[PDB]
Amino acid sequence: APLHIDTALPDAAQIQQSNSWLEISLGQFQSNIEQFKSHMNANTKICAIMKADAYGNGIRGLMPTIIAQGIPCVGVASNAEARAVRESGFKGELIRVRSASLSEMSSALDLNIEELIGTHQQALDLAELAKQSGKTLKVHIALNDGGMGAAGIDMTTEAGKKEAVSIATQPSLSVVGIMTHFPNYNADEVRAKLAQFKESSTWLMQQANLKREEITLHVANSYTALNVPEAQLDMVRPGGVLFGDLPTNPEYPSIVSFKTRVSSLHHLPKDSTVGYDSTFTTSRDSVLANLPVGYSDGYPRKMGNKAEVLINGQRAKVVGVTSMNTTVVDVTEIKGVLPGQEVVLFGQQQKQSIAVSEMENNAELIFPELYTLWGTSNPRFYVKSS
Amino acid sequence: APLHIDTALPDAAQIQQSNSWLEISLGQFQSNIEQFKSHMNANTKICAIMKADAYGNGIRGLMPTIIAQGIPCVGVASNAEARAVRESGFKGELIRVRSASLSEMSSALDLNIEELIGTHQQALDLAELAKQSGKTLKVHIALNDGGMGAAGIDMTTEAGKKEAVSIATQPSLSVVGIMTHFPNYNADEVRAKLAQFKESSTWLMQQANLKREEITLHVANSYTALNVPEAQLDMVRPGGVLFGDLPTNPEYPSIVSFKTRVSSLHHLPKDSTVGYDSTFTTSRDSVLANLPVGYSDGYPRKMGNKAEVLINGQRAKVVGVTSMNTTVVDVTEIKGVLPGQEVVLFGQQQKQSIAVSEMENNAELIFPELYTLWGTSNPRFYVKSS
Numbered sequence: 019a020p021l022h023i024d025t026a027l028p029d030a031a032q033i034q035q036s037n038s039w040l041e042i043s044l045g046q047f048q049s050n051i052e053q054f055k056s057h058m059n060a061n062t063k064i065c066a067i068m069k070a071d072a073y074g075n076g077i078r079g080l081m082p083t084i085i086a087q088g089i090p091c092v093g094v095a096s097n098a099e100a101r102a103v104r105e106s107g108f109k110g111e112l113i114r115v116r117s118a119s120l121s122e123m124s125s126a127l128d129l130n131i132e133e134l135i136g137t138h139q140q141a142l143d144l145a146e147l148a149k150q151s152g153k154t155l156k157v158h159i160a161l162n163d164g165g166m167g168a169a170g171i172d173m174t175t176e177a178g179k180k181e182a183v184s185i186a187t188q189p190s191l192s193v194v195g196i197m198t199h200f201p202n203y204n205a206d207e208v209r210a211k212l213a214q215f216k217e218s219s220t221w222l223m224q225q226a227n228l229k230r231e232e233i234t235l236h237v238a239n240s241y242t243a244l245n246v247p248e249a250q251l252d253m254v255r256p257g258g259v260l261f262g263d264l265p266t267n268p269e270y271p272s273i274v275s276f277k278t279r280v281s282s283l284h285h286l287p288k289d290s291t292v293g294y295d296s297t298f299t300t301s302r303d304s305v306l307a308n309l310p311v312g313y314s315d316g317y318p319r320k321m322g323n324k325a326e327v328l329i330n331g332q333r334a335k336v337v338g339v340t341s342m343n344t345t346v347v348d349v350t351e352i353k354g355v356l357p358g359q360e361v362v363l364f365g366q367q368q369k370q371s372i373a374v375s376e377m378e379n380n381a382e383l384i385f386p387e388l389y390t391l392w393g394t395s396n397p398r399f400y401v402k403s404s
Numbered sequence: 405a406p407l408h409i410d411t412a413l414p415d416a417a418q419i420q421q422s423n424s425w426l427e428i429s430l431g432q433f434q435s436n437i438e439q440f441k442s443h444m445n446a447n448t449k450i451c452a453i454m455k456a457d458a459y460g461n462g463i464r465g466l467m468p469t470i471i472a473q474g475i476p477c478v479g480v481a482s483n484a485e486a487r488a489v490r491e492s493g494f495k496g497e498l499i500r501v502r503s504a505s506l507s508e509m510s511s512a513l514d515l516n517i518e519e520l521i522g523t524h525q526q527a528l529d530l531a532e533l534a535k536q537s538g539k540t541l542k543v544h545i546a547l548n549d550g551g552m553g554a555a556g557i558d559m560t561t562e563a564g565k566k567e568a569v570s571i572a573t574q575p576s577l578s579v580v581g582i583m584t585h586f587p588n589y590n591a592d593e594v595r596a597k598l599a600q601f602k603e604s605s606t607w608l609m610q611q612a613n614l615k616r617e618e619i620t621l622h623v624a625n626s627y628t629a630l631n632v633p634e635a636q637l638d639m640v641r642p643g644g645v646l647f648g649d650l651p652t653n654p655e656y657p658s659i660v661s662f663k664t665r666v667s668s669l670h671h672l673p674k675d676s677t678v679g680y681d682s683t684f685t686t687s688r689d690s691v692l693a694n695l696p697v698g699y700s701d702g703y704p705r706k707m708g709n710k711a712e713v714l715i716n717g718q719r720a721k722v723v724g725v726t727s728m729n730t731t732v733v734d735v736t737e738i739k740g741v742l743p744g745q746e747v748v749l750f751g752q753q754q755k756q757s758i759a760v761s762e763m764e765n766n767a768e769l770i771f772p773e774l775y776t777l778w779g780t781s782n783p784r785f786y787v788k789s790s
């Protein structure tokens with residue numbers, strides 16, 4: 019992950035001299051948050067998950083919305099993300115959504131993160147940090163009732179239960195939450211695992227003399243919070259849906275568009291090869307648009323000869339493989355095309371739209387694989403309109 | 405591409421609190437440059453191609469080597485890259501290796517870039533910029549003899565030849581180079597296209613009254629410079645080989661390693677699912693290492709259930725799919741594993757090595773697709789040893 023999340027919010031002139039960029043619809047983000055809120059029980063609170071620099075959309079540009087919406091909790095993964103969240107002035111709960119090394123946790127003490135622990139050694143390490151800093155650190159215990167087998171303590175055996183109790187009774191730590199995480203969007207499976215989580219967390223609280231009314235039980239990602247409402251419990255952890263990436267729930271549109279522009283227009287006669295490996299040959303006298311975007315910007319090699327882009331409200335085929343820095347598009351039949359015109363790689367333009375499924379099929383990746391790396395590799399412009 | 409290339413060269417403490425990082429062997433880079441130089445004719449000069457933030461390895465950390473080695477020319481793609489090169493104090497020739505929009509070219513005037521033009525409109529636009537800035541701008545004309553059909557002017561028709569002459573005779577521009585670029589690593593094809601390039605460039609110079617001895621003819625990328633020596637001409641444009649990514653020439657080892665560390669160690673009984681979509685189930689009582697790296701760091705989803713990583717000098721299988729931020733590895737049979745230990749995702753560790761072909765097969769990407777996005781998504785540490 020980036021060591022530092024740049025403090026700049028790119029302006030129009032800066033975007034104008036960028037090769038490619040992301041356009042983030044702040045209105046759509048606000049709308050998605052408000053829509054999501056409308057479905058939450060009165061007794062659940064929201065922890066907005068902002069890992070991977072807010073799912074590629076950018077923590078620094080989105081935090082003022084999180085604050086204006088009065089969201090009480092934010093989740094992050096890296097220390098750079100924790101810093102960017104606190105630098106926004108956010109003074110609510112900040113949780114880490116993943117296991118973090120001791121070196122990560124120790125360097126972030128000033129940020130008041132509630133770490134996520136699932137092993138005795140993590141508890142021991144944090145207890146020592148607490149001791150050395152003269153404070154009691156707040157933690158969430160991750161349980162494995164969801165069956166992720168990743169961050170949590172599995173309690174299906176005697177040894178696992180014993181380890182769980184050790185975590186939960188560690189001196190110098192305050193257990194403020196107990197959680198799990200679900201691996202699938204199957205509602206029946208989530209309901210069965212939710213029941214098991216309630217059993218496991220109740221048992222653990224009994225064993226460690228924790229008071230239920232002081233513990234935040236939380237299990238729900240975006241899918242679960244909306245589609246298994248009884249799993250909302252004390253707090254929900256929506257990430258993708260806020261950004262409009264919950265594939266089961268298309269009523270939350272994506273907030274991200276990926277754009278470039280036509281650099282140059284080239285006349286190429288019939289029977290001319292295009293691109294590395296000469297994977298395409300013109301079948302007619304052609305006009306090709308040269309776009310200064312390539313796989314190093316996160317537009318994959320596989321897009322060539324498969325994808326279409328939008329130029330002047332019309333679909334144009336990507337021809338030849340995409341190079342490290344350049345993409346070539348056939349604009350032979352597209353009317354009105356000129357250098358400098360905006361090109362949509364993902365998003366809408368006039369009456370045309372590129373679907374998420376289309377992107378996925380062409381890239382042979384899932385959508386977040388695309389957009390998280392778009393976000394590390396391109397500036398974000400926050401559009402505020404409508 | 406990034407709008408700004410961070411000015412920091414991460415130190416050990418900063419790396420220690422990063423989740424994942426790249427290790428760049430400066431010694432290997434120096435060695436690769438010196439080895440490459442040993443094969444260049446006395447009359448050719450070197451333009452080190454440093455696009456995509458030096459192929460993910462980082463312009464700012466590598467420029468002092470470029471300068472110490474007395475390389476006279478650097479090539480870049482984005483304006484941010486041009487800035488990073490000039491900010492190193494490099495005062496040699498700076499060329500753009502791709503078509504760039506007018507908005508890009510106009511914003512970069514202070515950087516003294518020699519732009520790369522293949523259309524009349526680009527020539528006209530730059531001539532106007534020259535006029536308005538009271539100077540003569542230096543340009544390279546891209547020709548299509550290589551058959552890339554991307555940045556160049558195709559001269560196989562009368563109209564193409566006429567456009568080429570218009571580019572080459574534009575008032576207020578100084579043609580300092582004429583070039584092409586080859587789409588394949590086939591030496592016989594490169595030789596045939598080289599002959600055609602010599603014919604086309606000679607004709608163009610005659611038509612526009614250009615003086616051969618003042619024009620730099622250049623056609624060779626890494627592959628061509630080493631494997632078709634007669635194509636070295638006046639200047640070569642090596643990128644990949646300097647960084648140790650020329651697949652035909654393994655005698656230039658890769659300068660990049662991708663690393664993380666063990667965050668936590670988890671005991672998971674037999675018949676336990678791991679990861680989203682529960683694509684893996686343990687067949688025995690297991691110990692799993694949780695690594696804080698995932699696809700948002702550029703370690704693809706497809707690595708799960710396919711790849712191995714190196715921990716304590718031994719290979720360990722990645723189990724379940726990689727998530728946005730986390731990777732799980734089976735260390736059940738690995739002896740000596742402890743939290744905090746370094747993990748090699750790509751590179752060498754003790755007697756083990758992960759091959760480029762292995763990476764490619766597992767990720768279902770070509771190597772530069774991986775490393776360019778590693779470079780935008782992780783800090784670089786420059787190792788200076790041996």
Ligand SMILES: *Cc1c(COP(=O)(O)O)cnc(C)c1O
Pocket residue numbers: 067069115116199238239240241255256257258259
């Ligand atoms: C990312 C993550 C979430 C949010 O997941 P979405 O499917 O994007 O809503 C919630 N909890 C944890 C532990 C996560 O890692």
Ligand SMILES: *Cc1c(COP(=O)(O)O)cnc(C)c1O
Pocket residue numbers: 453455501502585624625626627641642643644645
């Ligand atoms: C990237 C590029 C090069 C260098 O290519 P390698 O195969 O990495 O050596 C040379 N010329 C142009 C025009 C390029 O775009």
